[PDB]
């Protein structure tokens, strides 16, 4: 098991290299109301076995804590919920993987405005203190991700970089979260931690205004890049991907990240990406394999967003693994993604 290996002092880039390529347990512990509330069955050790066997070395374990915790001042987290998170993490540690645990759909309380800052910081400190204490013994194969996509509420603002106020307060929250984790001591003082830009966006505005808490070299940047938008995410967008233009645009998106962070020794994980099912397997294969090698060529480790929903022609169909069957719904997409990542053997 990779659960209790202690904590190294290597550069974060090395950790990101070993994380290699990842798979998200999406719409699960992050689902509002509970693990199976969004149509996924209860997670099993056998499922995670298949993830490892396919060639994924990282499990991102998104978790929504809102709805499982009491009120201020303690915001006490339901102990059975906490233990369930720890149990799933060990499915992956048994497979010698990396695990990332975050706070996910916390937008009801995690508001990036000066007016909210004091109360949000108080809750964020309480939340991270409890999670960190629970996982204190785990070694550097356990990575904490301080927040998911913190941003100002509102449909019109979803794909924006927010205001300077928003970006400043996100930076303040990341520092609060990191300090809360590290103050618990032990392995939490030295483990690697991912922090997002506002909305985990890779756009110039948000990557340029990111401030790394304490300049801590153990900190990794968290970005979500469902690129290119129209092919990957939009049910009404093109079903085709493969032109020289497509390849060039994708490269350039990763080039921004490489020049701002990686080439300066700041490691970066693309914690979410992927494409939906538009009955276009050949195109998704081409895209998946190119994305993987182009991202990897820039020192980036990408993590597929798998929400367990794979129906052709429906929006949000990012699922590629069949959890009930223990088979792959999109075997060709999965294999191409893994194929583009390559390896050291």
């Amino acid at each position: 098991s990779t659960a209790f290996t202690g904590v190294r002092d290597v550069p974060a880039q090395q950790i990101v290299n070993e994380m290699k390529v990842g798979w998200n347990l999406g719409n699960t512990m992050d689902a509002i109301g509970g693990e199976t509330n969004w149509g996924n069955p209860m997670t099993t050790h056998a499922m995670i076995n298949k993830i490892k066997e396919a060639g994924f070395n990282t499990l991102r374990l998104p978790v929504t804590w809102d709805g499982h915790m009491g009120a201020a001042p303690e915001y006490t987290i339901d102990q059975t919920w906490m233990k369930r998170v720890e149990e799933i993490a060990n499915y992956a540690f048994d497979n010698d993987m990396y695990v990332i645990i975050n706070l996910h759909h916390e937008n009801e309380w995690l508001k990036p405005f000066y007016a909210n800052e004091a109360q949000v910081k108080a809750q964020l400190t309480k939340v991270w203190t409890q999670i960190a204490n629970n996982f204190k013994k785990y070694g550097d194969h356990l990575i904490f991700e301080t927040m998911n996509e913190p941003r100002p509420v509102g449909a019109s603002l979803q794909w924006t970089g927010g205001s300077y106020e928003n970006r400043e307060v996100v930076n303040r929250y990341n520092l609060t979260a990191v300090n809360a984790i590290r103050a618990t001591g032990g392995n939490n003082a030295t483990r690697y931690i991912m922090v997002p830009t506002l909305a985990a966006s890779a756009m110039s505005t948000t990557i340029n205004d990111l401030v790394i808490p304490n300049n801590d070299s153990k900190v990794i940047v968290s970005l979500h890049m469902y690129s290119p938008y129209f092919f990957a995410m939009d049910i009404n967008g093109t079903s085709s991907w493969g032109s020289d233009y497509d390849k060039s645009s994708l490269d350039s998106e990763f080039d921004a990240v490489y020049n701002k962070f990686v080439k300066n020794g700041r490691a970066v994980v693309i914690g979410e990406m992927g494409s939906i099912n538009k009955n276009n397997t050949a195109a998704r294969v081409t895209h998946a394999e190119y994305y993987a090698k182009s991202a990897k060529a820039r020192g980036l480790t990408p993590i597929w967003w798998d929400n367990g929903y794979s129906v052709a022609g429906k929006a949000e169909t990012f699922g590629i693994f069949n959890r009930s069957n223990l088979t792959w719904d999109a075997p060709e997409v999965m294999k191409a993604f893994i194929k583009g990542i390559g390896g050291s053997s």
Partner: protein, 107 residues
Amino acid sequence: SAVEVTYAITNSWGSGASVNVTIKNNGTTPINGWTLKWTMPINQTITNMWSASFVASGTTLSVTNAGYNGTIAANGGTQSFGFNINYSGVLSKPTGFTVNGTECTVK
């Protein structure tokens, strides 16, 4: 070409060998995120690689940087990596390489 590749044998033991590769950028533009491609003689197989990773497809070999060594500086900058191979027969070397699509000089 302004890009030079040095493909060298560190050590060989009859059934296998250790290779060191050095890429040199003599051009004016840094190479930001290097990839190196070549065609590998048959009856050679890469067993493990360090400071880089690779995709093998037949004899086609695509090598990618390890992030921390991703930029090959202009005006004589280098980056290096190495790997072990198993092989039978005569140990030979690739004689052509491309770095990010640019054909390299072999030194």
